[PDB]
Amino acid sequence: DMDRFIDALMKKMTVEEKIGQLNLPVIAAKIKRGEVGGLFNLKGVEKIRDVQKQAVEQSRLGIPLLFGMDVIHGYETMFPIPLGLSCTWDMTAIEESARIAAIEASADGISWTFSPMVDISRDPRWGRVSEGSGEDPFLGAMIAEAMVLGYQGKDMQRNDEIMACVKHFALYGAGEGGRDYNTVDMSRQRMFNEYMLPYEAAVEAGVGSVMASFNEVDGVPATANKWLMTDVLRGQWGFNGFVVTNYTGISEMIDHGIGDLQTVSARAINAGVDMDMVSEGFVSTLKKSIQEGKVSMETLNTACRRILEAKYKLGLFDNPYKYCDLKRPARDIFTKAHRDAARRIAAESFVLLKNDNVTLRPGTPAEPLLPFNPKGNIAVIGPLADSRTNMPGTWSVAAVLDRCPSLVEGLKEMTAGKANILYAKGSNLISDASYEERATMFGRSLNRDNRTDEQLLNEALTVANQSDIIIAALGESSEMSGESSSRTDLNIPDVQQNLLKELLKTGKPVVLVLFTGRPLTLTWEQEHVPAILNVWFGGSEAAYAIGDALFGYVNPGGKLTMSFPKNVGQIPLYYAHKNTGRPLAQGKWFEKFRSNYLDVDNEPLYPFGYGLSYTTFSYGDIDLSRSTIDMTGELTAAVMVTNTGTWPGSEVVQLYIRDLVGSTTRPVKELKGFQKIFLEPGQSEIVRFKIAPEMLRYYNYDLQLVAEPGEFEVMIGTNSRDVKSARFTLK
C-alpha cells in the first residue's frame, strides 16, 4: 500500500528533494538536482517521454514528473468553449467530451489537466465566463462532477484517464468591474449559498487537485488564505488531494501587497498550498524559512506527501511512462470518431434566441427563416464568416488552429452541388485597428488590410443583392474572451453592427449567426433581425455543426446558462436574486419608489434557461403528490410536456424552488433540477422530479446548512421566467 511506500521514499529525501517536489517551473540541470515536481504546457509524447527519462534515470531518487496542460474543452478535437457546452444541459455529453479530451491528451503524454474551471459569475464583462458554466451553482456543480468523472473515471487507473484540477479556488468570477484579476469581496453567506457549490462538488467527485485563484478574498490573496485552502477545502469538505497555485500566484502576492517573496511563500505553504507554479518561491526560500522557524518540517512533509500521493494514484511509481506510448497519437488524436462526437455536441450547444415569422413569398403566411433547405444563392458575410483560427474558441492551446474549417468552407462542403455559397468579408472586427490586433492575438488574425470599412461594406452589399438568403457571421473574435479579455461594452462591435443594419436594408432575409464568449447586449438585434442563433464558439467542427442547425439536420435545443442583459448598466443581473423590500411588480415599469431604474426595466433581454426550438412545447399544470411533508419525507412534482409543433426536438424541462419565507432573505427562485427530454410532434411525456428536504437546505445566518420549516413554491418550465407553479409545506 501507498503509505508504506511514501514513508519509505520520504525517509530518503533531503529537505531540498522534498522542496523540489513542490516546484512546478516553466531545466534538465534542475531535474538532475531533484528540483522539479512537474512540468506544464509541454506538447508531444516524444518530448514528454525524454523529459520523464531524465527524471527517472538522471535524478538521485528517480521520482517521476507530472505533466500538466490546459485541456479545457479539447486537446486537438475541440468541443465548444465550456460556456457554450454548458448550454447543452446534457451531463452525459459533457462527460463524453471530457473523456475524449482525456483519451487524446493521455495518448500524447499528458497526465494532468487544469480543468474544470467552475467559477460562478454574474458579470458578463469578465472574459473568463467563456471557461465556466454560467451563473448557476446547481448546474455548475452537476457539470463539475461530469467533467471530473470524464477525465479521471473511477480511480485514474486506466492509461486514458488523467488527473483533473478544479479551478480557480475561489470567488474569481466576482472580480470588481468585471475586470480580470481585480478585487473580490463578499460575505461568507454569499460565498456558500451562491459561489462555492461547484468547487465542493468537484472535491466530492474525487478531483485530484485544486488551483488557487489570483484574486483576494477577505483581503488575503487566495494563495495565502488558510481559511480557504485548509479550513474550507480540507476541514469542511474533506479534500484529500493537493493544491497548486495559478501562474506566478505566489510572487504576485508581493504586488497584492502582503510581503516579500519569502514571507508570502511561507504563508502559502502554511495556508495549505502544495505546488508552486512558475514563481520559484518554494524552491528559492523555503529552506531559509525552515531554518528560521517560519515553516515547520511537518508542513513541508505534508505538502511533499500530497504531491507524491498524486503521482502514486496516477500509477507513475508503477510506470513513469504510463502515458508515453509513441503508438497512441496516431490511434487516439483527432480521429473521425472524435470529430463526429464534437460536431454533434457543438450543434447541441447552440441557443436559438430568435426565429420570427417572415414574409418569404408574397401572399403566403409568414414563416421562419430557420431551418432552410440548402439551395440557390446563400451569402455568408462578416468577419467571422471565413476565419479558421477563430472557430475553436479561446483556451485551445493544443489545437491546430488553421486546420479547423471556416464557416464558408464548411458550408461550401455541406452544400456542394445543391447551392452557391457567396462570401464577403463585410467589415473588420472593429473600427479601431489597435483593438482588432489585441483581440486577435495568439494566431487569430483576420488579415486586416487597407480596405476601408466603406469598401468592405460595398463589396458585401453587391454580394448580398445576388443572394436568396444572408447568413451574417458576426460577433466576437475568440480572444475577445478568455483570460485578460474583459470588456466595458458588450455590443456586437461597431462596424459589424453597421454592416448588419445595412444587410437588413437590402430587404433580403438575414440570419444572425452569433459568435461570442459571453453574454452580449442585443436589444437592437432582438428588435430588427428575424433569426438569431447563438453559436458561441463551437470547436474545431463548428462550421459543420452550424450547417446542421441551419439546414435543419439538428433542431436547436440549447438553453442559456447565463443572463443576457439589456445594457451594461444593469450588471449584475441574475435570476436567483433576492426580492428586496420594494419589488417592482410585473408590468409596472416605471414606478416611483419601487426598486427600478429611470431608463430601462429590471429584466434581462434573455433570462437564464432561455432557448427556442424549431418546434414548440406546452406544459400542463404541476401535480404534487403531497401538499405537506416533514423533515424525513419526500414528494413528487410531475408535469406533462407536449410537443405542440411540427418538428421533432428536445426540451430542457427546468425545476426551480422558492423558499417563500426565511430567517434570512431567500432568492426568488433557485434551479434545483432538470431533465432533457426528446419528443416527436404530438407526443407527450410526464416529467417527474423528486423533492426532499435535502434539496431545500441553505446556509443560514450562522452558516449552518439547514432546511427550515415553512412553505415552498415549486416551479417547472421552459426557462427561469416562464413557469408553471404549485406550493407545499415542510413541517
Ligand X SMILES: OC[C@H]1O[C@H](O)[C@H](O)[C@@H](O)[C@@H]1O
Ligand Y SMILES: OC[C@H]1O[C@@H](O[C@@H]2[C@@H](O)[C@H](O)[C@@H](CO)O[C@H]2O)[C@H](O)[C@@H](O)[C@@H]1O
- Strand spans (E) along 193-347: 209-212, 216-217, 220-221, 242-244, 276-277
Give yes or no for residue 427 binding ligand X (CB under 6 A).
no
Q: Per-residue x/- mask for ligand Y, residues 161 to 200, rule CB under 6 A?
A: ------x---------------------------------
The answer to whether 600 is annotated as binding is no
Beta strand pairing status for 165-169 and 112-113?
A: unpaired
Give yes or no for residue 412 binding ligand X (CB under 6 A).
no
The residues in 499-558 that bind a copy of itself, with binding defined as CB under 8 A, are none
What is the distance, to the nearest Å, from the Cα of residue 382 to the centroid of all Cα atoms in its chain?
26
Please report, to the nearest 10 degrees, the dihedral formed by the alpha carbons of residues 293, 299, 304, 305 taken in order: 150
Judged by CB under 6 A, the residue of 99, 388, 666, 669 near ligand X is 388
**Which grid coordinates belong to 552?**
435543419
Q: Which is nearer to Mg ion, 449 or 711 (CB)?
A: 711
Measured CA distances, 174 to 48, 179, 246 (Å) = 37, 9, 17
Site size with ligand Y, rule: CB under 6 A: 9
Give yes or no for residue 428 binding ligand X (CB under 6 A).
no
Judged by CB under 8 A, the residue of 573, 605, 641, 691 near a copy of itself is 573
Give yes or no for residue 647 binding ligand Y (CB under 6 A).
no
Q: Per-residue x/- mask for a copy of itself, residues 171 to 200, rule CB under 8 A?
A: -----xxxxxxxx-xxxxxx----------
Report the distance separating Cα 659 and Cα 669, nearest Å: 8
The answer to whether 661 is annotated as binding is yes
Judged by CB under 8 A, the residue of 301, 567, 675, 684 near a copy of itself is 567
Closest CA to 180 of 243, 114, 116, 252: 252
Judged by CB under 8 A, the residue of 484, 627, 628, 725 near a copy of itself is 484
The residues in 240-259 that bind ligand Y, with binding defined as CB under 6 A, are 246-247
Q: Cβ of residue 681: shortest distance to a copy of itself, in angstroms?
A: 42
DSSP secondary structure string for all residues of 47-116: HHHHHHHHHHHHSSS-PPPEEEE--SSBSSSB---HHHHHTT--HHHHHHHHHHHHHHHHHTT--EE---
Phi and psi, residue 517, nearest 5°: -105, 5
Beta strand pairing status for 376-381 and 419-424?
A: parallel
Q: Which is nearer to ligand X, 355 or 406 (CB)?
A: 406
Which stretch in 40-48, 381-389, 576-584, 625-633 sits in contact with ligand X by CB under 6 A? Answer: 381-389
Q: Amino acid identity of 124? A: P
Measured CA distances, 519 to 121, 126, 147, 481, 560 (Å) = 11, 10, 23, 11, 9
Judged by CB under 6 A, the residue of 75, 79, 112, 114 near ligand Y is 114
The binder of 483, among Mg ion, ligand X, a copy of itself, none, by C-beta within 5 to 8 A per type, is: a copy of itself
**Which grid coordinates belong to 85?**
457546452
Q: Which residues contact 235 (CB under 8 A, 6 or more apart)?
A: none
Q: Cβ of residue 192: shortest distance to Mg ion, in angstroms?
A: 17
Give yes or no for residue 145 binding ligand Y (CB under 6 A).
no
The residues in 289-348 that bind ligand Y, with binding defined as CB under 6 A, are none
Q: Cβ of residue 666: shortest distance to a copy of itself, in angstroms?
A: 6
Q: Cβ of residue 601: shortest distance to a copy of itself, in angstroms?
A: 10
Q: Amino acid identity of 219? A: G
Report the distance separating Cα 189 and Cα 203, nearest Å: 20
Q: Cβ of residue 167: shortest distance to ligand Y, in angstroms?
A: 6
- Binding-site positions for Mg(2+) read 659, 661
Interface ranges with ligand Y (CB under 6 A): 40-41, 70, 114, 167, 246-247, 483, 593
- Binding-site positions read 659, 661
